[PDB]
Design a protein around this ligand. Sequence first.
Ligand SMILES: *[C@H]1CC(=O)[C@@H](O)[C@@H](O)C/C=C/c2cc(OC)cc(O)c2C(=O)O[C@@H](C)C1
Length: 305
Amino acid sequence: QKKLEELELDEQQRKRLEAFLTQKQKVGELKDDDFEKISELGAGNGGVVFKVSHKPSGLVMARKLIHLEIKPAIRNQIIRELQVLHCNSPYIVGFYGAFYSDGEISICMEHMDGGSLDQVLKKAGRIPEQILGKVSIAVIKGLTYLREKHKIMHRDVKPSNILVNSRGEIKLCDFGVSGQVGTRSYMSPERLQYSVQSDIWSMGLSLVEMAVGRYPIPPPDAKELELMFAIFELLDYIVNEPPPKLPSGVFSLEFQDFVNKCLIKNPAERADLKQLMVHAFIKRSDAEEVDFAGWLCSTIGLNQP
Ligand SMILES: *[C@H]1CC(=O)[C@@H](O)[C@@H](O)C/C=C/c2cc(OC)cc(O)c2C(=O)O[C@@H](C)C1
């Protein structure tokens, strides 16, 4: 009916956060020896990432390995810096722990069974508007948390940083680095010359990317839209040229307006989190009852039961 009732942290969310905490605690010490490899998730980037079983617990996790040599007590420091990922947000990927072994940093995260939205994009081709509404909500809230707690620089909001799962959860994985770009840049115009204003830009660029199915600078221009429905050069383009936009006709005017407000070049004019939270796209999005899990499971060929 017209119930519209959950909470600030819908008790389910609150419960899932508690459950995760408890499980993280009963895992205990994290030794290379306790990990049976299941598969190789999205690899490469800074380092390969593996899906693994942790024999003691019987938990599936995502373990990311970065190669870095030296291990002189100050490592238990480098590890302590990583221990700052030990975040309590529904819009932030869970962290189990981190260790060193065999000249290799391990960072063990919660297994998100839908993977990253860059990988979903490849299976989907395009990600539809109602799904990107829910994505938008999760990202905005995730930034809100980070801004009102971690004061963390984050780094970027890209599809590769947005993980999803068959429970319909959407979490940022972008986690910072102190670690002592081929055609695509998500850098705001202002930072090509910190704060959330840069992240609002990236999210806006990423929504266009996921909506059209293609990194949108330079614009498809040459029809492509009719069909569909270097770094240095690109940077001056982002600074000099006008921001991207969704094509018309295909996307709601609400949706076009929302992304338009994220991709205003001047950050003083560009929308802040508070305005996004009450934009009509978001209001409509929040009221829509979207079967995100079913969309997602079908798209990537995940067996639900
Ligand atoms: C967080 C994400 C990254 O750092 C980036 O490399 C990401 O795109 C690579 C994918 C990681 C991934 C993939 C799946 O697919 C099923 C599942 C999970 O849980 C993860 C993940 O959380 O990896 C963490 C370590 C990196």
